[PDB]
Design a protein around this ligand. Structure first.
Ligand SMILES: N[C@H](Cc1c[nH]c2ccccc12)C(=O)N[C@@H](CO)C(=O)O
Lengths: 515, 524
C-alpha cells in the first residue's frame, strides 16, 4: 500500500474548504483530510458543473446559504473616456455611452462563421451603428432591463454565473465537509513546518504543541505561501511587468433593492489609477477599487473610492489588501501543492479568482499521486496551472493595453508594458478579420483548455473600440450567408424583446429564492 | 470590387475535383472556377480508405446524400484499421501469427467512442485491470463493441439503415473523382479544360497571372490551386518553394498495388481496412463489393521494386507475370509553406504520408475547408496566408508523429527495415505524449461527450486513438493512473461499463446484417 493516507490542508476560506470538500468526494474516504485554520466575489458559469455538481449539492441549496445573486456578464463602465471615476457612464468621441458587456451567452453562426464576423463587416462598412454587445447577444437587452436569467418556475432563459459572500461559501462548505464528509477541522495557528532529509513535509506543528502528521500537504495559506514559498523555498514569479495593479480597498454598501432593482451582472467601473468592481447581492453590493500603489497612495485611492459611492471616508469600514500578481515557478513541489492565492493571482477583472481554485483542485484529483510522487504527474499538473494562469493574465493585459485612455500616469504606463507573444499573435489574427479561438461547443476538459474564445475577444476588443483592419474576406463571396445572418440579428432582437417582456426581474427571483 | 474573380485549379483526381466542388458551393457563384486536367490513362482501382468526418465536412456541405455518392463509386463500410502481425516477426501473411503470450497478433483502431466513469476514460480502468492481471482482454475488444462486430464481419447499419456504430468508407478514388467532376461541371458551372499545362506566367512579384495549355490557350487567373500531385508543378517548380523531406521520421517511400477479385459469398466482406505487416513495409487491404484493393507500402532503401512485388504477389497467391501492378514512388513530408503568394497547394503537391491511418483524403478537405475560411481578396493579406500555412503544418506534423509511433513502438527487430525504424529520432511532441502515457495519464482527452469542424481538426488524434496503437503494440503505462487507487466506487461503475460493452457487442453480433448483405441491398 504505497498510497497517500493523510492530506493536510493549511488555511481555510474558499480555497481550503473547496479543497477539503472536493478531495473528500474525489478520494471516497480512503484518505484522512485535515484543515488547519486560524467585499463580494464574482464567478464564471462552470462553478455548478465542475464543483457543486461533483459534490452533489444542488444550486438552490448553496445559493440560499451564502446570499447568492445572478451574474450574466461583466459590464465595463468608462474604460474608453477620460476623468475621475463615476458609476454614471460618460459619452464617447462618437457620442455613444462608454458601456460594453462581456456576457456568457453563446454566439450563433451562419455558414460556420460566428455572428461576431457579420457584425464587424456591417460596422466596418458603415451599414450599422449598433455596438457588438447589443447586436449579437439577447443577454444584453435583458441586463439593460435588470431581468433574471430564469423564469419564476425556474426554467433557464440564458446561461449565467454567480455573485456571493466568499466567507459565507467557506462557512457552508466547512460545515458540508465536516458533517457529511469526515474532514477534521483543527482551530489553531501553525508555528513550524517539519521537513525530512529530502525536503518533504512530514508534519505541521500547531501553537498548542500538537503535530499534524501528513503525506501530501495543500498550501491554502494565502499570499504568505507558508508551505510552497517559505518552507519549500519555491520562488514566486512577479508579473507586474504584465499587469500594474497590486493593491485594493473594499467595503459592502447597503443598497435599496426595492427602489433601484438588482443588476444581474458585475460592473468594472474605471478609475483614476485602477478600476472598481460592483458585485450586487440581496440588500447590499460588494465593491473594491483595484489600483497600482506606484501610481496612487492608499489615501488617494480610498478618497476616490468613497467619492465614487458618496461614502464618508471617516464613517465607513474599509479592507486594505496588497496582493501578488503572478504565480509560483511551480504550483506543486515535492509533496506541497498550492491552491488559490498561495498558487497564483490576478485582479478579479474577469472573475477568475474562484475558477483558479476548482481548476487547481480538479487537476490535483486527476494527477493525484501515491507516495513515489512520480515527477511526471507533478510536472503535468504544474504545466496545466501555468498555461491556465498565463492565458488569463494575457486576456487581462488586453483589457488595459487596448484602452484608448492616456489621461493619467497609470493608463499611459499600461501601454509602456510589453504585450506577451500569445496576445500579440491573437491581436494580429483579430486585425486580419479572422476569429480568435473558435469555441469547441456546438466535460470540463473542453471548458478549461479553450477558456477565452472568439466571443470573449470580440466583447473586449470591440467594446474598447479595437476593430479588424477589414471584414473577413470570405464574407465578400457569401451573399446567401450575409442574408442568413440578418435573420439571426432579427432572431436576437425578437428573443431579447420577448424575454424583456415575459421574464421576472432579478429582484423578484432573489426574493422568491431567499424565501 | 477587390475580389478574386477566377480560381484556376491545376490537376484533377480526388484533390482537384474535391477543391472545385467545395469552392463551387463555398463561394456561391461569385467566382469563376476552372480545372485543367491532363488526359487520364486509366489506372487499376487500388482502393482508398477514409475517416468518418468525410460525410459531415464534405458531402453534407455539397448536399450530396451518402447513398448517392456510395452507389456511384462502389463504396464499402470501414469501422477501423486492423493491424495484422505488427509485433511478431517473419514473411507477410493475411493470417495473424500467435504471440509468445498466446494472443493473436491483431489489434483494431476503431472510430467508436470511449465512455468515462468519474471523468476518467474507460481506457484507464482497462489498463489498471490489465497491469494487475485482473483481465487478459486486449484494449480493443474490452473497450469497443465495434471490435466484436468487426470480428463477426457485421455491417455498421441495420438493413432499415438505422446506425449501429460510428463508421467511415472504402471506395475507388478515380470513381469519386469522376462523380465529383460531373457534379462540379453540370450542377456548379465549373469549366473543365482537358489539356497539359506548358507555361506558368508570373507578374513582376512572382504571382501567377495565367497558365498556358499545350493547345496554346491561356487561362487567366487570380488565385491558383496546385492539385498537380508530387510533381508540384506550381508550388515547387514555378514558385521555387522547397519541399521538406521527412524520411528522417517515416522510411517508406514506394508502393506496388492492384485490385484482387474476391468471392464475397464464400468469405463475406470485412467492414475494415487491414494493415498487414511485411518484410520491408506493410500491405493495405481495402474491401469493396466483388474485389479488394491492396498495396504493399515499402522503403526502396530496404527492398528493391522486384523483392517488394514478389512478396506482395506471394501474400495473396497472385502470379507475378500474370497480374497488373501500379508502381508509385512518393515523397514523404510537406512544403516549407503550403500557400505561397497566390498559389495554394492541396493533396500530394502540399504534403503526403503512407495511408496507414487513411489521412490522404482528410488532408484534402482539411486544406480546402481552411482555404474557404482564410479565402483572400486580391490584396492577399500575408496574415491570412500565414494562418493557413500554420494550420497545414500543425495538422501534418501531428499525423506524421502519430504514424512514427506505429513503427517506433513495434517490438519487431527481425529485418534491416524494422530495426532502422528504431534508429530514427522520435519527434519531441510524441516523446512528451509517450512520457505522459507511461505515467498512466490520458493523452489529448477528446472534447466530445458523444461537433463543428473546429473540434474534429484541432483535437484529431485523442486518448482512445493513442491507447489503440500503444496498447495494440504492447507499449503500456509503467503503472495504473494513481488516482484509481482511491476510487473503488469508480472502479465498480467501470465494470458496469465493461458489461454494457459485452452486452452491446453480443446483441449486435446477433441482430445486425453482415457487411456483404448491406452492400448487396445498397448496390441494388
Ligand atoms: N479522435 C476520435 C474521433 C476520430 C476522428 N477522426 C478519427 C480517425 C481515426 C480514429 C478516430 C477518429 C475521438 O475524438 N475520441 C476517441 C478515440 O478513438 C476517445 O474517446 O478517445
Amino acid at each position: 500500500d504505497n498510497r497517500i493516507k493523510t492530506v493536510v490542508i493549511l488555511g481555510g476560506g474558499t480555497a481550503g474548504w473547496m479543497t477539503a470538500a472536493y478531495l473528500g468526494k474525489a478520494l471516497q474516504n480512503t484518505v484522512k483530510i485535515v484543515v488547519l485554520e486560524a467585499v463580494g466575489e464574482a464567478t464564471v458559469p462552470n462553478l455548478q458543473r465542475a464543483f457543486f455538481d461533483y459534490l452533489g449539492i444542488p444550486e438552490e441549496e448553496w445559493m440560499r446559504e451564502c446570499n447568492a445573486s445572478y451574474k450574466m456578464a461583466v459590464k465595463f463602465i468608462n474604460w474608453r473616456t477620460p476623468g475621475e471615476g463615476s458609476p454614471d457612464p460618460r459619452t464617447l468621441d462618437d457620442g455613444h455611452t462608454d458601456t460594453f458587456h462581456h456576457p456568457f451567452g453563446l454566439l450563433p453562426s451562419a455558414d460556420q462563421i460566428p455572428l461576431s464576423h457579420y457584425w464587424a463587416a456591417k460596422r466596418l462598412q458603415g451599414e450599422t451603428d449598433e455596438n457588438f454587445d447589443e447586436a449579437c447577444f439577447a443577454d444584453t437587452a435583458i441586463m439593460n432591463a435588470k431581468k433574471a436569467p430564469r423564469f419564476l418556475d425556474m426554467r433557464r432563459a440564458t446561461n449565467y454565473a454567480w455573485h456571493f459572500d466568499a466567507s459565507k461559501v467557506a462557512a457552508f462548505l466547512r460545515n458540508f465537509a465536516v458533517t457529511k464528509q469526515a474532514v477534521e477541522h483543527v482551530e489553531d495557528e501553525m508555528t513550524e513546518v517539519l521537513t525530512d532529509e529530502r525536503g518533504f513535509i512530514t508534519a505541521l506543528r500547531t501553537k498548542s504543541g500538537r503535530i499534524l502528521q501528513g503525506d501530501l500537504f495543500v498550501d491554502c495559506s494565502g499570499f504568505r505561501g507558508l508551505l510552497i514559498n517559505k518552507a519549500m523555498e519555491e520562488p514566486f514569479i512577479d508579473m507586474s511587468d504584465h499587469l500594474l495593479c497590486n493593491s485594493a480597498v473594499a467595503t459592502a454598501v447597503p443598497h435599496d433593492d426595492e427602489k433601484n432593482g438588482v443588476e444581474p451582472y458585475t460592473s468594472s467601473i474605471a478609475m483614476e489609477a485602477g478600476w472598481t468592481w460592483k458585485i450586487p447581492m440581496l440588500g447590499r453590493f460588494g465593491s473594491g477599487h483595484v489600483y497600482s500603489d506606484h501610481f496612487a497612495t492608499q489615501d488617494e485611492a480610498t478618497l476616490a473610492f468613497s467619492k465614487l459611492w458618496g461614502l464618508d471616508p471617516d464613517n465607513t469600514e474599509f479592507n486594505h489588501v496588497r496582493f501578488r500578481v503572478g504565480r509560483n515557478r511551480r504550483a506543486w513541489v515535492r509533496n506541497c501543492v498550492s491552491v488559490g492565492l498561495a498558487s497564483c493571482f490576478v485582479e478579479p477583472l474577469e472573475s477568475s479568482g474562484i475558477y483558479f481554485i476548482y481548476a487547481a483542485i480538479h487537476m490535483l484529483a486527476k494527477h493525484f499521486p501515491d507516495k513515489t510522487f512520480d515527477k511526471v504527474l507533478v510536472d503535468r499538473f504544474n504545466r496545466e496551472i501555468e498555461e491556465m494562469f498565463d492565458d488569463t493574465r494575457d486576456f487581462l493585459q488586453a483589457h488595459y493595453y487596448f484602452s484608448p485612455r492616456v489621461d493619467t500616469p497609470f493608463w499611459r504606463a499600461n501601454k509602456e508594458l510589453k504585450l506577451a507573444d500569445s496576445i500579440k499573435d491573437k491581436v494580429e489574427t483579430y486585425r486580419a478579420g479572422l476569429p480568435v479561438n473558435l469555441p469547441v461547443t456546438d466535460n470540463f476538459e473542453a471548458e478549461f483548455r479553450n477558456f477565452w474564445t472568439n466571443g470573449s475577444y470580440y466583447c473586449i476588443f470591440a467594446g474598447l473600440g479595437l476593430m479588424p483592419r477589414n471584414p473577413l474576406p470570405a464574407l465578400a463571396y457569401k451573399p446567401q450567408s450575409i442574408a442568413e445572418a440578418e435573420l439571426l440579428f432579427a432572431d436576437v432582437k425578437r428573443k431579447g424583446d420577448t424575454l424583456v417582456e415575459s421574464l421576472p426581474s432579478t429582484y423578484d427571483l432573489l426574493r422568491q429564492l431567499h424565501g
